[PDB]
Structure 1
Amino acid sequence: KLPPGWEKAMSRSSGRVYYFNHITNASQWERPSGEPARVRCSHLLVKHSQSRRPSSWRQEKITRTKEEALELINGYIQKIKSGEEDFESLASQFSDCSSAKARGDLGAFSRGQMQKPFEDASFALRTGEMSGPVFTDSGIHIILRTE
């Protein structure tokens, strides 16, 4: 059927079928197209008060709730998908990760190096594909697989 990780779903608001990936939290209308030793990804991290280190270059003390963090993530995803903003621009401006200064680029990595939900989403993404909200102990990620 579908490249594993993917399931069919029904829009509650339109009744149209769409596809959801439970590893990447990506969702799309089209039927999904369908592993390498390494992948390259960028990300945009929004931390919250329960993050492993509730601090970043943007904010000495990160006080926002997980819910508020997810709302910010959802808004970034919306602007990226509409083309109002580029992933790289939002990462540089708003990612709570030091990789903001590199447009969110983390370089290439193997399995075993990253936090598990991040790794699984990264490796389940296709080249050029973007995740939905991915939750780790650092916060909530938008992940872009670049290679």
Structure 2
Amino acid sequence: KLPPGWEKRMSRSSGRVYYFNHITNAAQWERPSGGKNGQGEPARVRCSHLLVKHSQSRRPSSWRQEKITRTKEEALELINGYIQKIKSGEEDFESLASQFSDCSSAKARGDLGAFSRGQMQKPFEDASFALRTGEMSGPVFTDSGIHIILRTE
């Protein structure tokens, strides 16, 4: 049961029960699904993203700053902060990506356009295709850094 990647979990040293997606790293309180079968995954999707680079990114530099020195742990801290702000409603995905994404797609408010499998780095690809329209991922690690992905189509 539950859509691809989803599983009911419980927080450790805490007792909060929630739903987690092992492919997208998404987490939420709501059950992800309420019969359709043999649906597979979309052959093409459109996604926007917000990238946070770190010292170990293949290109430790971005339009936002010449030299990226933050550690991977610091980047994850930032990513989690952006997710928290989006989930509270204090900020929107587009505004944050336009201002803080280390990817040049920031100029397009994070929009990457449409793509098929075999086009993006595997972790990014797996997460994008496991997202349903309008859903946002949790932290996704690639060689570029850490991403937050939003499927728009």
Deviation at 1:13, TM superposition (A): 6.2
**Deviation above 4 Å: which 4+ runs of structure 1?**
none
Segment of structure 1 superposing worse, 26-35 or 63-72: 26-35
Segment of structure 1 superposing worse, 137-146 or 33-42: 33-42
Deviation at 1:12, TM superposition (A): 3.7
Number of residues of Structure 1 aligned to a counterpart in Structure 2: 147
Deviation per CA, 1:101-147: give whole Å up to 9, x if none.
11000000000000000000000001000000000000000000000
Quote the Cα distance in structure 1 between the aligned partners of 2:19 and 2:73.
24
Quote the Cα distance in structure 1 between the aligned partners of 2:95 and 2:75.
18
- SS of the aligned residue for 1:51 comes to coil
TM-score (norm 2): 0.93
Deviation at 1:15, TM superposition (A): 1.8
Segment of structure 1 superposing worse, 130-139 or 32-41: 32-41
Structure 2 residue ranges without an equivalent (≥5)? 34-39
**Corresponding residue number in structure 2 for 1:20:** 20
Deviation at 1:47, TM superposition (A): 0.2
- SS of the aligned residue for 1:119 comes to helix
- SS of the aligned residue for 2:137 comes to coil
Sequence identity percentage? 99
Deviation per CA, 1:67-121: give whole Å up to 9, x if none.
0000000000000001000000000000000000110000000000000000000
Deviation at 1:35, TM superposition (A): 1.4
**Corresponding residue number in structure 2 for 1:63:** 69
Deviation per CA, 1:15-43: give whole Å up to 9, x if none.
23211001000001111129111000000
- SS of the aligned residue for 2:98 comes to helix
Segment of structure 1 superposing worse, 2-11 or 108-117: 2-11
Quote the Cα distance in structure 1 between the aligned partners of 2:25 and 2:13.
19
Structure 1 residue ranges without an equivalent (≥5)? none
**Corresponding residue number in structure 1 for 2:37:** none
Deviation at 1:14, TM superposition (A): 5.2
**Corresponding residue number in structure 1 for 2:36:** none
Give the aligned CA root-mean-square deviation in angstroms.
1.4
- SS of the aligned residue for 1:50 comes to coil
